[model samples]
Target chain A: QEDVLAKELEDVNKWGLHVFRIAELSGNRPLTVIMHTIFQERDLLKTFKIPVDTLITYLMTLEDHYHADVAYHNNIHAADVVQSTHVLLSTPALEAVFTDLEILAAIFASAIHDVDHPGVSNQFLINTNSELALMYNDSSVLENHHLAVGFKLLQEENCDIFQNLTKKQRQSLRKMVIDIVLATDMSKHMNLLADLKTMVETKKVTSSGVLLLDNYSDRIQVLQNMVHCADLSNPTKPLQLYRQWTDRIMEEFFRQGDRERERGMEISPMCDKHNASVEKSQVGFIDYIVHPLWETWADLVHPDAQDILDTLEDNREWYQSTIP
Target chain B: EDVLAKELEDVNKWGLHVFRIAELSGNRPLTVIMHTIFQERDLLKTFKIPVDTLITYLMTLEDHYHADVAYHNNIHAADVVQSTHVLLSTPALEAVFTDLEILAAIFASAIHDVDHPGVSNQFLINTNSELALMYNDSSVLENHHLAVGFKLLQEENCDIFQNLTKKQRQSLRKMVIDIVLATDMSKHMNLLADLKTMVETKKVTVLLLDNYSDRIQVLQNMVHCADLSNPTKPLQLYRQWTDRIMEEFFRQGDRERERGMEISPMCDKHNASVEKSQVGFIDYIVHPLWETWADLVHPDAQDILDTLEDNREWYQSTIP
Candidate 1:
């Protein structure tokens, strides 16, 4: 099991880390993928002068906290998104654009973007008047909570990964993490998608053909989109992987549907158990949500994203033909 | 030279008891602000901020404040407005800030708590209120009033900065937003923390304009201090505010109790000692902030600081 987990973590540093398979192998501790990807492979521990033992202490406890029973939105989802984010950032067009600080913040943001998710949607929380909806004042309920909860763990004993950073560095990193993680809120998708579309069209570049981000807003916009793209990366993945994700998400959504039914409430569209076949759901999801975003992204990264877009479209076609 | 004229005299003073003024003026919030514009800085004349536009805006802004709310109401805004005037007039700061900052500070104070729902941010969050939902449980009341204040300015008749330049309007807009948002208690330390570092390594050669962060701190701290000025006021004034705030807290807690939510400390009307609450608030919340502020002004706000001490002791003595 130890050797198996070691091999599993080796792939954590790269694009082909099968998080769903790793979830089965990691034995409910899928958050271990993040510890490997962020701390070891990224060398963030050495970069920030953190103790190896303390980093382990932090990640070990973090893994235990993510709800094991959650059908989706658990450690497995967290690991998948983090790996997707790594893959997206590794694209050639964006290679030179990110500063080391930006990469570190993006990695941290991706890892904890949905920490402590209650395995439900923000609207579900709002409709049911969940304590979180009230606590966050209904603004980006789950996203805001993940940030608050994630940052709280960082302050735990022997868990302050940023202790070596200057006050200014900590401030900038915190601001960056907050901005990008908050961007993961799906309510913000339409707005973010439009901005990314606009940015790609008007994006400034140096003579070297590398991207130029002039200020905080400009810099964070790309990072936000990078994380956003990763979050919605399920369909763009390999067909088999995408299928697994859809199954997991469907179960999660249907579970939420069960609650809605029992409570005499309207079910969330995707959560409705009888809503659509898997193929039909994927086709609509690809058309409405996934494909448009990947298209804009493909345009931004040029040839780098061409393959991801191809896989996405192939998956969409697969879903189309299988429908009905 | 009659009683009403004599009463109106102290209305413009630093030590003016707002609760008493409300008794005399029948409309102290309106009177206090109207006089400040006409008397103190010529805010109306200095900037082509229309007198009638400001009046209409103020009236509309005041109307939104929940009259039923005990602590946060139109009178609270007027008190902050008037209190902010004194802090702005601190000898070191009187001629320090620009006319734009001064006008903006007063404007921010005027509309600081407009449309306030008279509950804690956590209370709204616990209750799952529309405000909490809209603001995302972050600075619920502060964001609301600032939003309303900006919206009020959009009305044709209430375009107070109508004659100002694009640059001036934008600058004042930022100034008001920054100053108004700092009124949240959570932001108190950050404002105080920056200002403490500011007080040391002093640069007051006729208070030549400091850099942007340093300069903005004065106005933000001024408005913030004014917002929390209840405990720093005359004892009678402070005590009256304590009663008003406790009543608001009690009502909020009672609602929480009925809703089966855990009541916040200082919220339970009958569960805690009100006097003990006031002492802790001043000793922690109000005193340290004013103390640092006094150090910056170098005895100008000492009188204000002294009042907070006397007021704190006044509450302590009453505690069993």
Candidate 2:
């Protein structure tokens, strides 16, 4: 198991990194992949002057609190999203675009995006009148819960990775992370896509082809879309890998459906286990959500995301062929 | 200022200079609110709240407020609380509202805009503020204040409502939520319209002496009037508020420009039109609301309504 973990993590920066394999190798606790990818391999620990012990302490606390009992949206999902975000940020068009602070912001936003998620939709939370919905007043309920609970972990002893950043940097990291994570709400998908499309159309460049983002909105706009793209990147991966994600997500959905059915409440879309079109839903999600997003994202970053966009198409076609 | 504020307080129970009182209290609005609850209402004794718990709650509440929000800080909170105290104790309202409603009204005002970031709901919505996102852009800051306000109250040791029964606490919670939510600017037109209906139907003419419904309406408008009461204050006190508010708006305008966003009206620093804005404010918003309110309260609010008109004329004359 140790040998397999090491061998798979060897290609941690590769586009085809099998995050699911890494999670399996680590016994379903995938936070160690984050340690390898972000702190050690990405050199963010050194870049940000975070102590190795504190980093380990923080990630452990985070992992322990991540509700690993869920089918998805657990520690492994966070690791997968974090790794995807790191890869997305390194795309050539964005190579030197974001600062280390922003890179940390992006990676960490994804790392903690779904912490302690109850594996329920915000609508379910709101409909059930969950405490989270009341505390957040029913808007972006889980996203707020994820950000607040995850961010508060930093205040625990030996967990503050941002201990050395300037107060200004801390606040900037804060505002940027909040914008990035909140935009990951599925409800805001179209709005986020529209902004990304606009950015692509009005794309600006430096002499040698570096991206030039003008203001706070311009800069954060790219990061927000980056996280959104990463969160929905499951369909754009290798078919077998994408299939595993599809299965896990469907399990989570069916569980919610089962709960709703037992309570005599209306079942949510694509959630009824008995009648769900698993293959059809994936194709629809790709056709309606994933393809349009990455197509525009590929346009924004040019050829860097082209191969990923191709995989998205190949994956969608595969799902359609299985529809029978 | 401290000595004068104290002396004036002894001589006059209403309209004491809150700006001066806040100044003399080392910029802590806790003292002003504590004094009002003790001197005016005997809230500590009535509610069986230990004085220390009340002080602790107020101090913690003050801490929630950004230290210097230019306008929405704790000083403004104290001003609203004291102003509500004055409005409730008016001879027209003498013994009209129950102690629960009076306590709820004061508590609502003190915590209405708690933790304000000194921006409008429009600014929050436009910027995709987490606060706006949390409330779905419906009374963004107002919903925030109620949430954060209750969160603080529910905490250990910081709860002044600890002494109240479950029913008493729930009633206070409902009234506080309604009153604070009514302070949202988007709710202003609808709320004013509701007030008009009440007056038009002579619904309120039934009784100033009622227990809950009519009193809640009066309390909502009373706190709201104080929220807009700066124009009716003495000219000197009033100008201080004007400058602070304009300074806050101008800062928001600066942020809006830096974000490549549209600057809100009256927020632009360059074309500020400070005097003209006040005149327009009175003509368009404040005067009508206050005129209707004055009719409701009658002779007691006449002097302040007179001050409102005079303040309007003063700004109108200065605009050119």
Best by DockQ: 2
Alpha carbon lDDT of each predicted model: 0.79, 0.81
lDDT of 1 by residue, B119-234 (tens): 88878766656675455456878877877777776666988778998678768867887787788888888999988888886777645555877788878988888888888887
**Which residue runs does candidate 2 get wrong by more than 4 Å?**
B1-144, B148-226, B233-306, B309-320
* Best model number under lDDT: 2
Residue B218 in model 1: lDDT: 79
Q: lDDT tens string, model 2, A1-324?
A: 889788888876767687778888888667755555566877888888888888888888888888877887888778888888888888888767788998889988988899889998998986775678657655688887787777778879999988999878987887788888889899899988888888889899987697899798999988998898888999988888788888899999999999999988899999999999999999999999999999998999888898999999998888899977
Clashes of each: 6, 0
lDDT of 2: 0.81
What tens digits encode model 1's per-residue C-alpha lDDT throughout A1-324? 767877767776565567776777767667775566556776777788878777777776666667878877888888888878877877878757887788889988888898888888998886775667644534688898887777778767898777888877877887798889999999999999999999989977787777788898989998999999999998988888888888889988889999998999887787777774667778898999999998998888787888789989888888898865
Tens digits of per-residue lDDT for model 2, B1-320: 55735633632344566766666777775555555556556787888887777777778888899876898888788877777777776666665788898889988988899999999998997785667545544577987897787777655677888889867886787788889989987778877887776666553332354446666777788889879988887788788889999999999999999999999999999887899888888898898898888777666788888988988899888875
Interface RMSD of 2: 5.3
Alpha-carbon deviation at A309 in model 2, angstroms:
0.6
**TM-score winner among the candidates?**
2
